[PDB]
Amino acid sequence: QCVNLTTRTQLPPAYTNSFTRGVYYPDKVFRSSVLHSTQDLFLPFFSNVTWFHAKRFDNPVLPFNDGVYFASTEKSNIIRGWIFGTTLDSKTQSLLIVNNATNVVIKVCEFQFCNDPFLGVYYHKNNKSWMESEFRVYSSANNCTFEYVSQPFLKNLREFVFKNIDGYFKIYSKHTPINLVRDLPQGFSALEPLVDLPIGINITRFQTLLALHRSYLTPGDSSSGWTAGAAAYYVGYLQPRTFLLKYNENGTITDAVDCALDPLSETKCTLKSFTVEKGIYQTSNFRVQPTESIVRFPNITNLCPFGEVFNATRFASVYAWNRKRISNCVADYSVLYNSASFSTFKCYGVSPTKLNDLCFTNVYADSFVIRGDEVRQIAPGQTGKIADYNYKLPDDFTGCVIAWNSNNLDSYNYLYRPLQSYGFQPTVGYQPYRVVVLSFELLHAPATVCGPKKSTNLVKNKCVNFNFNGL
């Protein structure tokens, strides 16, 4: 199908005023004549609600921020549903709601919605009553899970509140006959739930489904005579507000006040009454919030002699590898981790980027020269000549292992532990490799080796969030 109508119409949006509107039953629990304060998603009073029109084709895909309030004048059944979804395309499930005249159909399929989804309407002359509806909503709809059928949801103003909470799609509706001229009325009316579909999909955008007649037909246009009746629908957005819902004796919400709307309503809420006596009341507290953080720490000191091992003018042989202790310094692992000069860099336990935050008691550097074919031996629970007659790693926690090919510098002076010499010929697995193992001592003593601590500029005369040397 999929005839597109949105040729060029690009008028700027118009806002009417949702006076006191879209107050539903935010609860399934009966109340006597009590002034109950509820905190939930609501449409704030006297808010600017956008005003779209049946004519001008007005079916833009709109954002489903937290849940919307949908109102509609429509003396004739011209609004036929909504296509809530995320992408409104394939590869993402979308929700479709449509009612014909005597039945409402709800589907959550992998729809292939059109750019201008709507429903054609036709009246056959033998019986002028069947409004023979044609679907121009989607081209493909397959592989879906939810399908619910009931009596239809629908100057006969109709109001809806859709909200997507924790896998549930909740619909609250209220249909009222209205006499006012064009816009939303003023009388308070409380929406009450229709259904709670366990749809469980993500909804971020939505679009209403129109019913268009075909007034005329040019031979090839498909977009010739789609007259759009005469109606109007308004789309408001639910915001988390606190209300004070006056329940009746019977449990009907006869009135409400919007706490965050203005100081008077806030007072009515905090006093839990619709009438406030003359006086002064305390409602809340003002607090200036911080605008930025300032973190700041001691001033950079001695660096760990990461200045001595990987350099070594000569490395010791693996039969008599060296074990140097390093302590009481700041260990910048970022430089070595960013360095591309290392052929291999395997760390166990902690990612190499978090070592700046972590602290240790001591660190030991096991430095020796091996071959690339023997690099696999530096691992817990490994066997082989090196692991069995030479440096052997424990089965337990290991630190970090660093290796790199050293052909240029080290290619019979190097022996391996009955002792044999490497055939290092300066001409890949037989080239020399230098290996340094970082073993961490994390319990032996109070911590003295730690990463540095990035400082930030200081800002004065503003409420700020600070951290002075741990205070």
Binding site: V276, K278, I280, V288
Partner: peptide
């Protein structure tokens, strides 16, 4: 704090910020 005549008289309201200078947010009276 909220100064009100009462919903039985008018919806007009004055708001008092109790210990703050008039430098952080129709007529303002320090």
């Amino acid at each position: 704090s909220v100064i009100t005549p009462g919903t039985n008289t008018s919806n007009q309201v004055a708001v008092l910020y109790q210990d703050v200078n008039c430098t952080e947010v129709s007529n303002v009276f320090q």
